[PDB]
Amino acid sequence: TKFLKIKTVSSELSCREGQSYWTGSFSPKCLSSRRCHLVGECHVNRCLSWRDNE
């Protein structure tokens, strides 16, 4: 004589996930460095057409 008891705790109504992401607050830090013209990279064509990854 073997028994198979199934005890029920409570009834929960969870939500199924699909698309998730991690967010949060951020505050950048500005760093400036003025360079004169005709000195190293101080030119009129290097500041305008400047890439955001170099």
Partner: peptide, 8 residues
């Protein structure tokens, strides 16, 4: 210091 800001 944390950040570095130069001046010429």
């Amino acid at each position: 210091l944390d950040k570095l800001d130069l001046k010429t």
